[PDB]
Amino acid sequence: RNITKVLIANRGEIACRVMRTAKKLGVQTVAVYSEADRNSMHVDMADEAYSIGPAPSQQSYLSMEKIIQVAKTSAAQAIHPGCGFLSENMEFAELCKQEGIIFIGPPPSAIRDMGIKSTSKSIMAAAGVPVVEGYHIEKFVDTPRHVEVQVFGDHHGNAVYLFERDCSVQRRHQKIIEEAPAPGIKSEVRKKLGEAAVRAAKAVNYVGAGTVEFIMDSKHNFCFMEMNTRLQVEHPVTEMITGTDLVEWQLRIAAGEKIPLSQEEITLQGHAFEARIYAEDPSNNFMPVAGPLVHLSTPRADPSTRIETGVRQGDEVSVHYDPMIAKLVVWAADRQAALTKLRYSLRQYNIVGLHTNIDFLLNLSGHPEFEAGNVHTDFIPQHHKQLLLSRKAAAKESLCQAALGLILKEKAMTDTFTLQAHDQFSPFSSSSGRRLNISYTRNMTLKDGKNNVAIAVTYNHDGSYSMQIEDKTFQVLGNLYSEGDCTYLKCSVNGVASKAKLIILENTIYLFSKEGSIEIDIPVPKYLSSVSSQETQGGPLAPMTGTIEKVFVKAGDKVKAGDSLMVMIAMKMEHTIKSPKDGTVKKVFYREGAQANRHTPLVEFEEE
Amino acid sequence: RNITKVLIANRGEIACRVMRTAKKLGVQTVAVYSEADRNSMHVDMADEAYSIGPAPSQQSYLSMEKIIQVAKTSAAQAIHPGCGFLSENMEFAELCKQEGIIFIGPPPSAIRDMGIKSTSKSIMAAAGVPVVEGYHIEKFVDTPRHVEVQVFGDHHGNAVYLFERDCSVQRRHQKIIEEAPAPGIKSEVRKKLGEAAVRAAKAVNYVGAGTVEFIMDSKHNFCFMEMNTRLQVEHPVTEMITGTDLVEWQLRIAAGEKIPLSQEEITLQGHAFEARIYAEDPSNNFMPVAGPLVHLSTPRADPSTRIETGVRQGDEVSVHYDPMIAKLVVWAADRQAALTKLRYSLRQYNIVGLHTNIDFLLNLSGHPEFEAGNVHTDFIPQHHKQLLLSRKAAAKESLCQAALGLILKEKAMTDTFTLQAHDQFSPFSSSSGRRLNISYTRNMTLKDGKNNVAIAVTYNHDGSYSMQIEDKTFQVLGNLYSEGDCTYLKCSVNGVASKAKLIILENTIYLFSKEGSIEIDIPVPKYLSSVSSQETQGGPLAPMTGTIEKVFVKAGDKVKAGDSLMVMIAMKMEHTIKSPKDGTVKKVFYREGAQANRHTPLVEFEEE
Amino acid sequence: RNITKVLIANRGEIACRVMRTAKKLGVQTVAVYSEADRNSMHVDMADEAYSIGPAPSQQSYLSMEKIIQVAKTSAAQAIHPGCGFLSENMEFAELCKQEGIIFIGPPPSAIRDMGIKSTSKSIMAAAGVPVVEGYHIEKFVDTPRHVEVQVFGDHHGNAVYLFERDCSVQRRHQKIIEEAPAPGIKSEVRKKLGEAAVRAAKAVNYVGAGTVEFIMDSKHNFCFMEMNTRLQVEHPVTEMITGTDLVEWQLRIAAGEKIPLSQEEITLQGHAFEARIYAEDPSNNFMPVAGPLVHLSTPRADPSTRIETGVRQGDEVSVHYDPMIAKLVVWAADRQAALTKLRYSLRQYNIVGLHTNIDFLLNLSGHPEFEAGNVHTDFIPQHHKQLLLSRKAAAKESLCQAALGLILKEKAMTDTFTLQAHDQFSPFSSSSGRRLNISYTRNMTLKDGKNNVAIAVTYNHDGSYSMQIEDKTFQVLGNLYSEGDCTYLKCSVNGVASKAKLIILENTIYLFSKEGSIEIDIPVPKYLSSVSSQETQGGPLAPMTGTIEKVFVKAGDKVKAGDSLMVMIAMKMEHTIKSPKDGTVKKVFYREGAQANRHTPLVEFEEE
Ligand SMILES: O=CCCCC[C@@H]1SC[C@@H]2NC(=O)N[C@@H]21
Ligand SMILES: O=CCCCC[C@@H]1SC[C@@H]2NC(=O)N[C@@H]21
């Protein structure tokens, strides 16, 4: 069946991923979008794009009728579901078949047979794959470790495997770092591991990519857990170690062609790692965070370094969709070298505007047990104390660099003003800070954490700066240069030279260097701060848009700080609102079952 | 023999092609040029360039004496003849040898022995290659099909073949689409096909590239037709399937080195296609057209996509030289995928200023029998009904996009004017079209073919546009962005988003999208049109510069519309001038045997 | 041992070379610098950089204590010594080991055992490698052909070789052109040659790269000369023929990993050449020259063409450090093709501001005996007659091109002035040189060598120029275009078109074309030349900063021109100052043992 036009029934990075390969093959691409995704990267990337309705996925990306209607209207011969949404929906895959549209994935029978745990285990046990597990009175025989096999099938029924991936490093089951191949598994053991899975794949004559998830013990005995009837999120680590494009194979096999390479042809070189980037706050129990990507600098990409990004600077993460920002994958000759490359690369990644898991991934990828390959499903719970750590006071050299950056920003502003003046060469336009027969010393104040740091900066005739912090003096000289769109600060402190990325947003100075990142706060004059800002806040504002599940306060009720007022469920996450003050409650703005928008007043308190 | 400097005794794409490889090898390059080619791409590309006289090729590129004189003056050790001109001239190849200059091609004996059909057939029959043919009482035993083999020989006499190419798709013998390998020929059959040709190549000890042209029947029996004693035009499809550079091999073998790879070393991967871009009007019986390349946008080039272009935007096609504009070749894993890639690529190619065969190539490459590989030499005559088709009325969405493009062009002009004004931020400089307490509705008229379309455009406050055509309303919003040197229009009509290349030349709006290309005409106000433009045209103007072969009208003769007045031959193509009016002939400006320049008055008619 | 941070205990190109590979592997890089190197390319290239004191290498790059202190302060786990300085210092390698820092090189024992000729010969003779030599009463059998083998060892003791390199083309033992493989040595002979060296490498269990230097006779008998216990300067020719990175192997092996590829895996393809760009004057007996790199244009780099440059335009060569400017290496399918590519590339290299050996390398690489591969250690002395040649008078076409370049520079200046004027379209701003009813003829004078050339330039209406030199007239037309940062002149003289790089510095016009380079001097008006410039120069100025070893003149002494006044040693090179005039000596500014700075007056002569 000639696939010349494909509809991508998904959004974000996976839609861009599929479109890349479709365009590389000369296949025309159709995007779908919600009202919230109208300006998304996958819409601009497609050859055609169609609106499927409002921002909630139940009314857009999960609306089978709208997706089929767009596939008909665009004359797309095939639908690529990507991952999540309709990719594991049996009714949607059968509807595509009824409508004469090629579903690029497994048959509706394989989706249904794998969607029910008891059914899937019974099929896997009958296929030879082990079916042991701990179930409710529930105590898992083998709780630790997670190892999965990429398997590929065809309409013909021929089946192949692609080694294995370690996904043991998970937080609340959510996979965080994936690696391929899984460390410490012998080529012989993995070959046997895949072959038992391959027989099951032939048994269901699975067509398209499938993944057999195994639980592996400390002795490398493995048992079947489940089969994900889709492309996995972490498929890039497999692609990096095999040199295959799994989406390209999905399109070819959905068109009816046989598997491109024999098992003998497949060869393994090197090791690869993947670390998903998540709009989460690790310090606040990995709460998801929504907000703008005010800065989104990225590491330069090379064949080893792949940035799977569906978002661009200025994009806003949405409460409706998944919080992932990007996925970073690397390939290297050795696993240790790959770990080193990922950590250097992570430092180059910069995200300002919302909290992310990047610093958590840096701590995790540098943990001694992770470096050793001693991974299991409880790794994050077990090493929670080390993986999460507090801020430490900055060094005086960092403060000197921050002051130099502020001074250079002022100099740049002066040059910008000079550009538009008729007098372009007046000595007054210089930033020398020069005086007659004396030297100018500037008293600057910077805040590091809660500490105010006083810096005495002296403008030298030669153009350097002498900075004194407490009893120590530093000789500082540097300049600003631009690489791409990022301003870089090149400075030398007491003869030590270094380079860092400088961003000054609001009253915070951001310095990004391969050593680390430091934030310094510029004190805000009181006058500029609004004097007498409005007081008497009206109750904690809803953490997010969610249904009100419980109300504990009547119209007039005396409450003390810490008295629960309301309970709200948002995206299946319970939050309890607590009393800010000991004041009696004047009124309540919401009742039980009401949906309250983010940051909307919940309770009114009597003025005291 | 050390070839450190080569003269290229040719022009256009083939001169650039040879110079590319010569420069890649560190060989110095000498161009020759006519007065008409002084600013041609191959002149600017060479390390040295020499004038060889006036525009007619008989007095320039065919002047053996001038080419030899330049080779001596530039101290070029070798001459590369390319294809056409002196490449198959035996006297020129012998003259190069007499003058101690290396002719990069076959020996003068092989050129002469292949230049006479009876001689070439007798040699081929004696070499085992089959001699059958239909000749005058002429009825070809096998008229259909044209399969040819790339063969390479050396001074040593070793000979190799490079699979085969299908050139069956030809119009008036002129090859139009070529493919390699030829579809439906088995690897075993082609191996035998090449081996019989190889024995003939050894028999004439042919040195340099040669092509054995075969006629193949529906049973895959093949018979020798002729041997072209040169590099073929369509050699790039062979290079794309073998990974060889045939010009590089020609230079090495002309220097005296042995063939680089053994027959065992040669391997075949994938399939490739080549389409020739011709300055022709398919709707007017494929008449050649001369004129400026006002726009010459091209598809981006990748290793699979090769643009063999000797012309650049603003170049003028010449009546003296060949009308080819460029050749497009693609390589793919499968032949069907290659056909898809070529068609997508052809849409990206844009040519404005003269008629081309590109839309004919798009229809041909999408014909069901061509997709099946059911090709033969009569394919174009047999399918002429479908391959050529009429214009169809445009959709209302296309008209909306054209109106949006016109409005955005006006906005860009407004911004350009604003740039030079002292009031850079006045609200008047906006293109909002805003009114107080009412909405501005603009009545625009556009011409699609012969139909005038009335569009009522309403300027909305948000910046969008509401366009009404007949009884249908469309919500239109978009903007202009630049990629390279091409302006692109990004628009959304009724929620449907699309991208297209926008060009507004004279009174025509050109919209190029992967769906297709649409031209919309902006009506020309009568006042601007010169009122009372001069009437009484003096006879049809010569279609081109050509000799007058016949005159049918005396100084005073009464003629009726359709009465032939004169017959003119131009580049061996007969045109008969016909009487425009029933008026009696006042005078004749030319007599028989005179050469009449293009667009010069031929007959004077009495004023009535 | 995990090497995540490396200190590079070197400067210039080799520091940049090591940092390239370290950064490619994700290893952090620490530079060291002297006060003179504060702005050097390797300082800006490193992730961290530290000052090691003043410009003299004895107080900076040879200060073991400072290098170890920086390695400790930066927390570098390893030191890469590069080549020269501390790379062959046994005490430094032992000090690194005592301090727990990985020395990236051979063990201190191997450095010491190879540093003494008698010890090294005794070890080599015991290892089977031949010991024969001519020693003092010192004489040899025949002129040597220098052939050396790249050998690599590991801590395990496994040893491998990498074919061989010809370094026979040397001036005063200084290697000038190196090639790999060495021409005329059979693969079998080289295999045996390497194997005898490999046994010695195993005998000292050498770890890291080593080179066994052999003397080879005209019969290809070879004898051990010495073993350089470091990376060789000319290692890039080996890398180009093997496809290996020897610095990458040095880092891996210093970390403790086994050799990456087996001897069976290693394969040889093509041939490669390396020429060293020296700041030397070949015409003045290859005296080293210090000064600014005012222009440093370079050939474009491709995988075959590697520019190993540690200097950038505007960099100043230093008296303290080595005079090398850059090293040029090429790889080709054949040795003859590689020689052609290097010569074309050398012409593209442009160096203005100091004398270089580039024209000497062009003459050498084009010498018939060098083209034949008839090289030996006396090649430069034997052929000194041809390799060094005088300037030849320029052709009239070159003078025409120079005049055209001057005129176009004036036109560019006129356009620059016009840019800032309110009247931007006045006809006066044109450079037509037009007159009413007559033609403007300009009398220009240019100096070629010692000859003044009078050129009569006539400004034609069409924009061309008619230039008459003596009795010959030339029709000249051209324009200026910019490629990158280099201005190019495109001109046509009497119908002959050519391109050249144009630079006009001070009063000299530099024209660079693949044919050659020509300098034309613009006469300096007398008035602008300072009239009555100060006379009575006070003795020859010190050729460079050096100790005064001898003084031959008392406070009042009568001397005649050519009477030696003082002897000075600079960087171990004796210069004798001679009397400029027959005047009696008024005074002496220096005594014996004093250090005299460059260009400082040495003797005062009585006014006459
Ligand atoms: O409803 C959305 C998915 C997660 C909650 C569904 C719960 S989990 C406990 C119970 N068992 C099911 O199979 N579904 C619900
Ligand atoms: O003259 C130019 C080439 C085409 C016309 C030549 C004609 S074709 C009929 C006749 N037979 C030849 O061999 N030449 C002429």
Ligand SMILES: O=CCCCC[C@@H]1SC[C@@H]2NC(=O)N[C@@H]21
């Ligand atoms: O001093 C610097 C190196 C070159 C000069 C050293 C001289 S060469 C003659 C004598 N023999 C040595 O081993 N060193 C000195």
